[PDB]
mmCIF file of all heavy atoms in Angstrom:
data_model
loop_
_atom_site.group_PDB
_atom_site.id
_atom_site.type_symbol
_atom_site.label_atom_id
_atom_site.label_comp_id
_atom_site.label_asym_id
_atom_site.label_seq_id
_atom_site.Cartn_x
_atom_site.Cartn_y
_atom_site.Cartn_z
ATOM 1 N N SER S 18 28.142 6.451 6.695
ATOM 2 C CA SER S 18 27.738 5.402 7.621
ATOM 3 C C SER S 18 27.191 5.987 8.904
ATOM 4 O O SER S 18 26.144 5.532 9.374
ATOM 5 C CB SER S 18 28.858 4.481 7.888
ATOM 6 O OG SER S 18 29.279 3.787 6.742
ATOM 7 N N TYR S 33 33.322 3.307 12.221
ATOM 8 C CA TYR S 33 32.631 2.279 11.437
ATOM 9 C C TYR S 33 33.525 1.829 10.274
ATOM 10 O O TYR S 33 33.978 2.630 9.446
ATOM 11 C CB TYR S 33 31.311 2.801 10.954
ATOM 12 C CG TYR S 33 30.422 1.667 10.575
ATOM 13 C CD1 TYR S 33 29.934 0.810 11.573
ATOM 14 C CD2 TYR S 33 30.123 1.350 9.254
ATOM 15 C CE1 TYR S 33 29.137 -0.271 11.250
ATOM 16 C CE2 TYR S 33 29.327 0.272 8.941
ATOM 17 C CZ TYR S 33 28.843 -0.565 9.937
ATOM 18 O OH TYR S 33 28.061 -1.633 9.681
ATOM 19 N N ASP S 34 33.738 0.532 10.198
ATOM 20 C CA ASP S 34 34.555 -0.140 9.187
ATOM 21 C C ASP S 34 34.223 0.491 7.832
ATOM 22 O O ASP S 34 33.107 0.353 7.310
ATOM 23 C CB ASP S 34 34.319 -1.633 9.344
ATOM 24 C CG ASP S 34 35.066 -2.524 8.359
ATOM 25 O OD1 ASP S 34 35.512 -2.029 7.301
ATOM 26 O OD2 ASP S 34 35.192 -3.718 8.687
ATOM 27 N N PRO S 35 35.191 1.144 7.179
ATOM 28 C CA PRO S 35 34.969 1.847 5.911
ATOM 29 C C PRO S 35 34.769 0.910 4.699
ATOM 30 O O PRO S 35 34.430 1.398 3.656
ATOM 31 C CB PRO S 35 36.172 2.797 5.769
ATOM 32 C CG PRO S 35 37.264 2.108 6.582
ATOM 33 C CD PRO S 35 36.581 1.310 7.670
ATOM 34 N N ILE S 37 32.333 -1.746 4.931
ATOM 35 C CA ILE S 37 31.002 -2.317 5.058
ATOM 36 C C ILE S 37 30.076 -1.415 4.204
ATOM 37 O O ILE S 37 29.944 -0.189 4.436
ATOM 38 C CB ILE S 37 30.538 -2.504 6.510
ATOM 39 C CG1 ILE S 37 31.484 -3.410 7.328
ATOM 40 C CG2 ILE S 37 29.111 -3.020 6.523
ATOM 41 C CD1 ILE S 37 31.095 -3.508 8.780
ATOM 42 N N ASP S 58 24.022 2.413 2.038
ATOM 43 C CA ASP S 58 25.190 3.137 2.522
ATOM 44 C C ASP S 58 26.417 2.703 1.718
ATOM 45 O O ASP S 58 26.924 1.588 1.935
ATOM 46 C CB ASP S 58 25.367 2.871 4.021
ATOM 47 C CG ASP S 58 26.628 3.435 4.622
ATOM 48 O OD1 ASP S 58 27.080 4.462 4.125
ATOM 49 O OD2 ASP S 58 27.126 2.836 5.660
ATOM 50 N N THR S 59 26.859 3.493 0.762
ATOM 51 C CA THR S 59 27.902 3.012 -0.187
ATOM 52 C C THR S 59 29.276 2.972 0.431
ATOM 53 O O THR S 59 29.662 3.841 1.241
ATOM 54 C CB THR S 59 27.871 3.853 -1.438
ATOM 55 O OG1 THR S 59 28.274 5.241 -1.188
ATOM 56 C CG2 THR S 59 26.542 3.772 -2.141
ATOM 57 N N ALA S 60 30.083 2.056 -0.085
ATOM 58 C CA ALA S 60 31.479 1.989 0.340
ATOM 59 C C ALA S 60 32.231 1.194 -0.707
ATOM 60 O O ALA S 60 31.596 0.593 -1.549
ATOM 61 C CB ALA S 60 31.525 1.389 1.760
HETATM 62 MG MG1 LIG G 4 31.136 4.019 5.564
#
Side-chain angles (χ1 to χ4, degrees):
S18 296
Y33 200 68
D34 179 342
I37 302 176
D58 173 30
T59 64

